[PDB]
From a paper:
We determined the cryo-EM structure of the prefusion stabilized SARS-CoV-2 Omicron S ectodomain trimer in complex with the bispecific antibody GW01-16L9 (FD01) in its native full-length IgG form, revealing 6 states of the complex with resolutions ranging from 3.47 Å to 6.11 Å. From different states of the Omicron S–FD01 complex, we revealed that two scFvs of the bispecific antibody synergistically bind to two distinct epitopes and induce the RBD-down conformation into 3-RBD-up conformation. Thus, although either 16L9 or GW01 alone could not bind Omicron S tightly, the GW01-16L9 bispecific antibody could bind Omicron S collaboratively with the help of each other.
In state 4, the “half-up” RBD-3 opens up to the regular “up” state, ready for 16L9 binding. The same triggering process then occurs on RBD-2 (State 3 and State 4) and RBD-3 (State 5), allowing the binding of the second and third FD01 to RBD-2 and RBD-3, respectively.
Numbering used by the authors:
A (entry chain E): 3 to 110, 125 to 251
B (entry chain A): 24 to 68, 79 to 141, 156 to 177, 181 to 247, 261 to 349
C (entry chain D): 3 to 114, 124 to 247
D (entry chain B): 350 to 620, 641 to 646
């Protein structure tokens, strides 16, 4: 569980400070990750390991991990910085807890596309596919990060680059089966025991680490996302 | 080697606590050297016995240039416990707390020890811890506190060229270093420079738990000290904090004789028990 | 899961050059791809362990170079009369079983270990479904308590797969098929080393093989000696 | 992994916060305590043990686990209060010339004692034969080198793993942590915590001649009067903050209600105005 302002505010020209509070079981023993998502488009990585930033993210963002809470800072925000900010952290209980989202509104190359959605009969379901194009799938891990329409994001399951131990969420445990194949870049996620509470996008998120995000508690992040399909069961 | 003896009139007082005091008379209770005690008169004109280290020593190092340049401590001295070499060679006083059986006669280079082990501590302090009739008297008070080693020191030039003996006068000692390494120590061994190619004499006292009254000066130094276990006159200056008592009769501690035997007479015990007859049986039972 | 050709019979002994694709990597760490020749009846026999330096055996099968992402074992010019199955091992990642491949019919024609150390089994004829049956491979030669041995089972039609791995003294790793229902227990340190069934789930009908050496992390071990298996023949 | 360092570090202010910016580490999992609270706990001596393993073997370095490296080269008990700091070093420890330098002791007789180093090179004897030194069919090299190559993928790359074992025996602790300090305010009613001894009062300029070894300073009572700053070598007198009594002078609640106040021990400057004795 992570506490984050639901909808903050701000004025142009100056800077704001978005915070994320967490216990010592998840943040105190790991590193927080800040993700930025524009309204309408797929999310993207903003700040990883609380110290470094990706090549696409400019110096307009900064993060700190003073104590058991994370603090964001955007020196000189503008209209382009009006997006949703999510906090994510790997807890020591084999889970990946995400934030809630911060509506920081101010009114003045490898494709990871996946598919396999569509409305189906309740109770059962179909398989969730994913693909890429020449990105060394063996040396990278994959995550399933679904996002309900209008709601926040949450972590479903993780597969490591080695293809051995895998982890699921607290609600999708048992009735989900994630696996890969020796063919080209792909990812197969089979779902069972559909409870109609799964109307989301199921982002096939690309990572940079190799093993499961439990042994590497300082390099685990999330690379460029991919355009997911809108699966709406609706019973 | 007949070990002689000397006197310790008013020598063996150090600063108990590192607190500034001015124009006051403080009462302290710690390990100190009793006044007018018996201290060995080991003469280094050969001598290096393994004296005990029950609680603290008052090692004197009366020399001329470099005769006494080190000490050693330990309880087993057979490669069982860690040692403490305090060698004082040229601009190096590096203390080693390793564990090794050096030798049976540490004369003094690497001739002190003969092996090494997992040294748990080593101090690398740079400043070394060391005329007609002006010699040099230097005293080092040591203790066995569990916290630190409590190394004290004081150096001063003497005036007259009288035979080797502790002069008459007061001189406090201030702490220099505090080694935080803890190790049980029961004996010690002086490390003298051979330099063969009298001469020197080192005194060794023993500290005791006593009560002292120290007079601090206006700048913060101890002018004089009074022990409460020397004479009935000092007991008055201890029970009433002062250095010049007035004329009259003063109350002091209570006199009491301690016993030296134990009587545990219990009544005669004629009939012990019939258990002896019960136990003795060829066929006890099934 | 690996990729192997179902069969290979065209151009016998001239352009066969079977291999095993489906790696998509650089063979992980130790580039040691083994090749086993499973013959019907007796236990399989080792053919080559590294890409070169074939062991003491037939010298007309060598040059197993790693072309692209697959070890192309050059088998041309060997012979024109053989009925066996070639299996290749790869995917040497940490704690990853099922390193074997699918059944590759390398029969060029189709129609046309005993005294080394020891070979003994239990002979599980008409095994009752469930229960607990113990199978031993007592070796009067090589030590049965110091070397790294393993247990591999194979069923009619399906290929081999890693079923049990046991290290020197302090590891009892189990495969993913049993997932815990199999409990490996070493016998007397100077007599033998046996296994335990522990209430099989009708999938242990395959025949077992107690190998004196590891399969994927294979070491030379002087010589590769196997033992004949026995049919479980469950009656569930 | 068969000969790993055992650096005994002590007598310093271990600033673990600096370790988060020295090198781009990939693992900073501390099992015992939190890194924020680690800088406020004293320790006697830290045992630094470093080695190099593959990427798929970093998971085997845990307080209790089996594996080809966890029970054959380095084992940690279920009491490790340190960290498992590790990072990839595939920039200077991988050249294409043949990396026959490392080893991992593939062969062994039994699991090693936790926190033990076995520096041996004898030929592994697999029983039932006296091996006075031979290599065939009964006794082989118990050591085997890695296959680290630059043109490989993550998971089989040189990963440097360094653990910091902590211990607390019956000895005074040396390594505690870097202290913190603020500005030195002038004479004012404030609170002070100078090197241990705390208190509240006013810090004024003192003219006492302290000895080069005495830090604190007291009076006839057991209260600190003057103290020297342990980071600038300046003496300061500590005078307790201004307190006193408050008396009320009233002509009587029968003729008027105007009253006067008398602050005892005040210099009409640290509370018409009248300064009396
Ligand atoms: C004390 O120190 C002051 C200043 O140095 C000096 O003038 C005075 O003579 C000293 N007195 C004693 C007894 O130390
Ligand atoms: C303590 O550090 C400060 C800042 O570097 C320095 O000015 C001061 O002189 C140091 N302490 C001493 C020896 O005065
Ligand atoms: C304190 O009181 C005295 C009384 O004569 C006065 O002269 C002085 O200015 C007052 N201020 C101080 C120094 O505290």
């Amino acid at each position: 569980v992570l506490t984050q302002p639901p909808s903050a505010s701000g004025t142009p020209g100056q800077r704001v400070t978005i915070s994320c509070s967490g216990s010592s079981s998840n943040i105190g023993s790991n590193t927080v990750n800040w993700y930025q998502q524009l309204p309408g488009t797929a999310p993207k990585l903003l700040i990883y390991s609380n110290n470094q930033r990706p090549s696409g993210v400019p110096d307009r963002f900064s993060g700190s991990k003073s104590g058991t809470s994370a603090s964001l800072a955007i020196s000189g925000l503008q209209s382009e910085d009006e997006a949703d900010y999510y906090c994510a952290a790997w807890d020591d209980s084999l889970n990946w807890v995400f934030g809630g989202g911060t509506k920081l509104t101010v009114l003045g190359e490898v494709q990871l596309v996946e598919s396999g959605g569509g409305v189906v009969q309740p109770g059962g379901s179909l398989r969730l596919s994913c693909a890429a194009s020449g990105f060394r799938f063996d040396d990278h891990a994959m995550h399933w990060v679904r996002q309900a329409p209008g709601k926040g994001l949450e972590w479903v399951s993780v597969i490591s680059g080695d293809g051995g131990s895998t982890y699921y969420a607290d609600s999708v445990k048992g009735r989900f089966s994630i696996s890969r194949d020796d063919s080209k870049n792909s990812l197969y996620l089979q779902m069972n025991s559909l409870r109609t509470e799964d109307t989301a996008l199921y982002y096939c998120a690309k990572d940079r680490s190799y093993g499961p995000p439990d042994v590497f508690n300082y390099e685990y992040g999330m690379d460029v996302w991919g355009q997911g399909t809108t699966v709406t069961v609706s019973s | 080697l007949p070990p002689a003896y000397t006197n310790s009139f008013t020598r063996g007082v150090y600063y108990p606590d590192k607190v500034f005091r001015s124009s006051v008379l403080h009462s302290t209770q710690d390990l100190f050297l009793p006044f007018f005690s018996n201290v060995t008169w080991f003469h280094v004109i050969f001598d290096n016995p393994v004296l005990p280290f029950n609680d603290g020593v008052y090692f004197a190092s009366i020399e001329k240039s470099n005769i006494i340049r080190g000490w050693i401590f330990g309880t087993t001295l057979d490669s069982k416990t860690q040692s403490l070499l305090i060698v004082n060679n040229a601009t190096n006083v590096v203390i080693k707390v390793c564990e090794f059986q050096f030798c049976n006669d540490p004369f003094l280079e690497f001739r002190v020890y003969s092996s090494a082990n997992n040294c748990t501590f080593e101090y690398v302090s740079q400043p070394f811890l060391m005329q007609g009739n002006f010699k040099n008297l230097r005293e080092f008070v040591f203790k066995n506190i569990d916290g630190y080693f409590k190394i004290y020191s004081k150096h001063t030039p003497i005036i007259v060229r009288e035979p080797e003996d502790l002069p008459q006068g007061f001189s406090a000692l201030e702490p220099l270093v505090d080694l935080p390494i803890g190790i049980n120590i029961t004996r010690f061994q002086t490390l003298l420079a051979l330099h063969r190619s009298g001469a020197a004499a080192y005194y060794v006292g023993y500290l005791q738990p006593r009560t002292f009254l120290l007079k601090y000066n206006e700048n913060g130094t101890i002018t004089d000290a009074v022990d409460c276990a020397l004479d009935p006159l000092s007991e008055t200056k201890c029970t009433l904090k002062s250095f010049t008592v007035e004329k009259g009769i003063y109350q002091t501690s209570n006199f009491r004789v301690q016993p030296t035997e134990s009587i545990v007479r219990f009544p005669n015990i004629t009939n012990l028990c019939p258990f002896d007859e019960v136990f003795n049986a060829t066929r006890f039972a099934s | 899961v690996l990729t192997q050709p179902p069969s290979a019979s065209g151009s016998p002994g001239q352009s066969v050059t079977i291999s095993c694709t489906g790696t998509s990597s650089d063979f992980g760490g130790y580039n040691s791809v083994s090749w086993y020749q499973q013959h019907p009846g007796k236990a399989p026999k080792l053919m080559i362990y590294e890409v070169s330096k074939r062991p003491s055996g037939v010298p007309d099968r060598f040059s197993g170079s790693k072309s692209g992402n697959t070890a192309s074992l050059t088998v041309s010019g060997l012979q024109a009369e053989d009925e066996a199955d070639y299996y290749c091992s790869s995917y040497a990642g940490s704690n990853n079983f099922d390193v074997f491949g699918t059944g590759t019919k390398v029969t060029v024609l189709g129609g046309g270990g005993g005294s080394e150390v020891q070979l003994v089994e239990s002979g599980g004829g008409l095994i009752q479904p469930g229960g607990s049956l113990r199978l031993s491979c007592a070796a009067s030669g090589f030590t049965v308590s110091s070397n790294y041995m393993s247990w591999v089972r194979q069923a009619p039609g399906k290929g081999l797969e890693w079923v049990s791995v046991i290290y020197s003294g302090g590891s009892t790793y189990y495969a993913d098929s049993v997932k815990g229902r199999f409990t490996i227990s070493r016998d007397n340190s100077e007599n033998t080393l046996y296994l335990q069934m522990n209430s099989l789930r009708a999938e242990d009908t395959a025949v077992y093989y107690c190998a004196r050496g590891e399969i994927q992390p294979y070491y030379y071990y002087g010589m590769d000696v196997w033992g004949q298996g026995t049919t479980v023949t469950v009656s569930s | 992994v068969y000969a790993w360092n055992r650096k005994r570090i002590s007598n310093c202010v271990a600033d673990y916060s600096v370790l988060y910016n020295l090198a781009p580490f990939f693992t900073f999992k501390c099992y015992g305590v939190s890194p924020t609270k680690l800088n406020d706990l004293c320790f006697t001596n830290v045992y630094a043990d470093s080695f190099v393993i593959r990427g798929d073997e970093v998971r085997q370095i845990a307080p209790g686990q089996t594996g080809n490296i966890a029970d054959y080269n380095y084992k940690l008990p279920d009491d490790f209060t340190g960290c498992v700091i590790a990072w990839n070093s595939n920039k200077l420890d991988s050249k294409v010339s043949g990396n026959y330098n490392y080893l991992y002791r593939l062969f062994r007789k039994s699991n090693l004692k936790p926190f033990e180093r076995d520096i041996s090179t004898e030929i592994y004897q697999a029983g039932n034969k006296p091996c006075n030194g031979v290599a065939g069919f009964n006794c082989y090299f118990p050591l085997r080198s890695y296959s680290f190559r630059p043109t490989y993928g993550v998971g089989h790359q040189p990963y440097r793993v360094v653990v910091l074992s902590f211990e607390l025996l019956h000895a005074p602790a040396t390594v505690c942590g870097p202290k913190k300090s603020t500005n030195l305010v002038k004479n004012k009613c404030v609170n002070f915590n100078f090197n241990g001894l705390k208190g509240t009062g006013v810090l004024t300029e003192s003219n006492k001649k302290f000895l080069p070894f005495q830090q604190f300073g007291r009076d006839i009572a057991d209260t600190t009067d003057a103290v020297r700053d342990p980071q600038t070598l300046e003496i300061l007198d500590i005078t307790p903050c201004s307190f006193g009594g408050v008396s009320v002078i009233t002509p009587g609640t029968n003729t008027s209600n105007q009253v006067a106040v008398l602050y005892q021990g005040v210099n009409c400057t640290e509370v018409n105005v009248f300064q009396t004795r």
